[model samples]
Target: TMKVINDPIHGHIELHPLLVRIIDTPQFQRLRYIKQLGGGYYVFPGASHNRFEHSLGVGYLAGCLVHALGEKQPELQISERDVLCVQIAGLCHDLGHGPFSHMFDGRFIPLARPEVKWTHEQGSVMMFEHLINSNGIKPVMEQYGLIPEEDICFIKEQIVGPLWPYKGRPENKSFLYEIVSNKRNGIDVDKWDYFARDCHHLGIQNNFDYKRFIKFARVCEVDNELRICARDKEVGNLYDMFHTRNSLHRRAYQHKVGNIIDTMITDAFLKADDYIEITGAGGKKYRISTAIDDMEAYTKLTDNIFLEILYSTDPKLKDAREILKQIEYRNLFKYVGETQPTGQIKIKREDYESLPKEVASAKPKVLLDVKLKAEDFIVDVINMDEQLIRVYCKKVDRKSLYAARQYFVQWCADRN
Candidate 1:
């Protein structure tokens, strides 16, 4: 039976029986409550989209990309099973995202428990195992002509991607890695969906034509491993894809107000961390940091936990609730100023190179040298692929904002 889902971004997406069964699971459906762009809706207003729909969009695009290649080049020996597995990988790629999506793991966990190293990509793998094995969804997958162990391994590898020497992955079909989560070029369906969907909601314009890229995709052995490549004619489209990515980050994802809202939410979550407890399978208890270690407990969590804190009568959660109340009333942090790669106060390459790998890599953080209150001043080095340092300060007074801005500008100048 074919089931069709109408998506705002992709439109009339068809789900296979296996994918449908996976979507119907409570573990997957929990994504409905998790925001796709954390704290962005407060700024964008229309950015109320959640991860559930985004996952489906990625899955649909994954299927489209692989099927297009399979149909055009039968010599590649792509099978129906291969295409299905790729779609499933895309669909479940974000199964590990916690409350408010990236804010949970990216910000709160680091502050609350600096000892533990974590990422949602790792969480996705842990959650995939839980969904298939502990959640009893494995038999259903196997029933639909999917291999539980072999195919499951392939799916997990796609999520983790081709890291290093290829290892256990089939070398010839390495092109599949580029479809869902492109570790090589970062031009995967995950970006395709978010750029278009987020642009639509955030009211930004995106000119990336994913369909055109899929139409021209070809698999060929480069150096040693097989990789996906676009036709020379589509080179302009590829540039547009990356251009859209930078624009999205610069305009919407890194919007000063949006970043501050995310920071506020992270602060509230950190305040209520111990007071809020999550239960996993077999009644295992987990804090926010420990939840990702076990999907069963993580699945029981979502953005709803924010509401729990906001509405709670518990004296223990009073401080946390007060922080959220600020957000509710639009008492957001003030945007001090941002540093550019050019013009005055530009961040030099060497100084940018010295940032913490986490902030430098992609996840943003506050630089600790300002000698200001940790809760009052928010310093973030935005743009993982480029250098753009942004600093935000909580509302104290205009005099402090001016003082903080000048101090930060001098700080950047001194680094060079």
Candidate 2:
């Protein structure tokens, strides 16, 4: 059984003891320090809340949806464990976001690259494992008589990925992380939450009923991976969610001002990464300082440190400071255009090989396609005779969720 915690975003969030344990971990605590909208503060001043709170909101929403599903379809496959996984995954999904957030991450990290790859999801797993080992979470597991270490390891493996059959990383085996982290699938929590949250934060008049679509969500395994599906009736609401998401990205998340700030931050990080190890910052500072302990001093940084350095008169970082001053007071460069990278953009490898060393090293434009998850739609729904048959056994009138996907598409394409 679970108890409800009142939340502003979602009316009440249910907290299970196990779920609460995970949230109490230091790894999840870090999320509180990370902002939900990242650079959106430049546009929506009130969007300053961090991932910690937004995650709580998402957790609350997930609980409501899950509990609702359980109530609706008692015989369904949904279980307390399933709900726990989703909620835990939801609460800590963005834990790995770097300071100032995705703006700099996409520009320099090349997380998409196979070699020096990193993502918030990857970081969250790393943090979780660290907590598991350091804080006696392993012992706690023993006390609960829950799944054995190996079994829990299997689930973690599914969540992280099977990077390679033999790769030793703990979280890579489970495909679990893919559920909440995926950006493309219709039901990914990242999209479902952000679309509405960003719109509200930006005060865009784009409002719709979130509860309706969520109440009709399901998962279909395609390409040997999970994808979200909406009941036929929920198609209209799904479209609204999709278009609203697209619009929010273009208007707020990818705003020109935000991009410029992102650019400035990226430049600063690159400069710091190059010089941090050359200095002496180590320990927790090693990431911002040296690549490893006993290595050269790198930036030895946190968000505050980075900002402080940006505002400093350090001659070593003169260039970064100059960019920061411009960004500090909202003076950002104008955007010209971006060659949005799609699936085809992978061909740039051959093009890079043909170019000179200096030219080949240049950063190519790429769009980070986020991953989506299974719970975006109502927990489960079936279509019979072109009509949605609600699976939860509710004798209620359900409206069509599909919109004039055409008009909405045109509306946004023309409006912007």
Candidate 3:
């Protein structure tokens, strides 16, 4: 049994009965309050949408894309179930995203010394699985004909990774997960839905032809491995997707006033992490109490929680309380200057230093963007006949392309 739900972003979303049942479950219902864009609402006032509906929209688009692709290129070998898997993956992709979106997670929190760490997307996988296992939602999901615990987990892991394993024994290795968890590449659904949907809603004339892009996206197989690639016809769509994203990041997302507000929020969380301490019944106090990790403490938290912690007469949270008071009573930080980079974010040192007392020391921020070039990261394509082909009819040589691949490896080293 299928059902129809009307949508402004995509017309008439057809909900398969099984998928609808999964949506009806309480596990999926948790997404209703999770904002899709987080601090983005401050910029796009109309953009106060949540992960729940956004997930549905992504699921619909994923299914549509896979179906269209499966039909056009039979050699690529996509199935209806594969489409469903991607849709389900999208639905749960951001579950681990902390409260208040990327602003709450990305800017406020610092990563540990192991390496690059704790993308909310990575936590999303654990969070979704946590929903099923802890809450008995797994059985409810199983009732709706969900294949297995592993099946759902596989998709969840796809959009989030340890995409590449660390230097150790092999654990979970699945190619399907890589395509689903794409961070780069012009032909990702994460960009596809966002590029068009945001452009439409914001009345920005940056719509790319989705149909054509899908047509040109070929799941090429080479050297017994599969990859998603865009042909010549689809290049324009990819370009449109790229520039629109860039424009949105600049004209809309990176407005200065919003950065000030973000700084305030950042100060709040950092203070909480830094100064706040706890004691347990049996003389055990962890950095984050179980209450905090279990989502109880933060779920009730809004921007106002910062106020209580900041202004409280409580002795435990005494340090940096003064800084929070200034932020509350008067905007403390001075905004000196800002810049936009090609693929990176730029913030001035003076602006950052003025607010030093308020935030965690060594404030991690992005600056200086690099324009992503075409030939960079253009991996060798494995074709349909188990033959590897270089991109753009170039002789199957690894010099230019492999040189680009080496950068990612070196980039990894820089992090360590």
Candidate 4:
């Protein structure tokens, strides 16, 4: 059996019966609440898209790419089972993402709990096991000619890339790893879906055309391994794909106000971290950040926590709730002045600082001498590896704003 889904990015996406079963499960449907781009909606209002649609698009494109390659080169012997597994891998690639998408696992987790390092890709693998085991889909998959033991292993490799010893059975099909999560060329279907879908929502023009790339895609031998590569003629298109990635980072993902909002949300989440408890599917209760390690608990987590904090009247959560409430009124952290590495001052670490003590200490002094303290300030280093710096300060009176700007500049000059 096959089912067709109407998608805004790709029209009439058809899924294999096994793939359909995976998507219909409660574990997969939870992606609907996880925003694709965290805090980006606050910046680009139209970027309200969630991981649900993006995952579907990736699955659709992955199937389209593999199906095209298999049809064009019958010698590779791509089977129907192979195609279905690849599609299933793409469909469930983002199953592990926490609330607010990347912000939850990437930014907030690191800040809230510095000891544990968790990535959504890792979570995806954990949840993939949980999804199959908990939903009792292993027998269903085998019934549809999909081997749960072999096919599921292949699917996990596609999501997290191949490990040493190559656990994916009959490992000659290593090229399949490149389809959904390409680390070599960064030209996977994941990028294909996001570049197009994000551009559509951000109202920007997208130059990368995945359809054309797929049309010219070929599996070739590279260093004794099968790899997916595009025709020489499509080299320009590949560049366009990466260029689109950088453009998105600059225009939308790293928007100054957007980054500030992310920090504010991070602060709010941290404030409420101690009070909120999450119950996993196995009835194991865990703290918010640590819940990522347990799929049962992680599945219960989503962006709904944002609403829970915003609407709650708990006294202990008041600080966090107030921060979220401010978002509704356009009250957010202010951007101050940014400092880049210069000949006068050498900066070894140019990473994005959420709230560095260096900046924190100087901010108060700058305001103290000027008799100002109501306004809060944060320093953001955009294109951190590229050494570009941006500063934001909470909105304050005109005179204080002017004074703080000069003092901040002086502080940077004196320190660095």
TM-score of each: 0.86, 0.67, 0.65, 0.87
- Going through the candidates in the order shown, the clash numbers are 0, 43, 6, 9
- Candidate 4, residue 137: Cα displacement in angstroms equals 0.7
Better of 3 and 4 by TM-score: 4
Tens digit of per-residue lDDT, candidate 3, span 288-307: 31223443333333334455
Question: Candidate 2, overall lDDT?
Answer: 0.50
Candidate 4 structure quality by residue, lDDT tens digits, 236-325: 877777788888787777677777788788778877886887887667778786787787777778888888889888799888877888
Kindly indicate the candidate among 1 and 2 with the higher TM-score: 1
Identify the runs in model 1 with alpha carbons over 4 angstroms from their true place.
162-164, 339-376, 402-416
Candidate 4 stretches greater than 4 Å from native: 162-164, 281-283, 341-355, 361-416
Top of the candidates by lDDT = 4
For model 2, what is the error of residue 303's alpha carbon versus the real structure, in angstroms, after optimal superposition?
A: 2.5
How would you encode candidate 1's per-residue C-alpha lDDT over 1-416 as one tens digit per residue? Answer: 99988988777878888778777778889888888887887877788888888888888888887888889788988788898888888888988788878777766766666667777888888887877875677777778776777887788888885446554357666667667777656767787787888889888777877777777777777888787777778778777777888778778777777877887888787767776677777887888656767666777788888888888898998889889898899777777666545554544323422343322223213343333444455665454665566766665677666666656666556455
How well does candidate 4 score on lDDT at residue 40?
79
How does residue 80 of candidate 3 score in lDDT?
Answer: 54
Colliding residue pairs in candidate 3: 96-124, 221-382, 221-383, 222-382, 222-383, 344-369
Write one digit per residue (lDDT tens) for candidate 2, span 6-59.
744556656777667777765556555556666557666877767666777766
Segments of candidate 2 deviating more than 4 angstroms: 1-4, 76-79, 111-115, 148-151, 154-158, 163-186, 217-230, 274-302, 311-315, 329-331, 334-343, 347-416
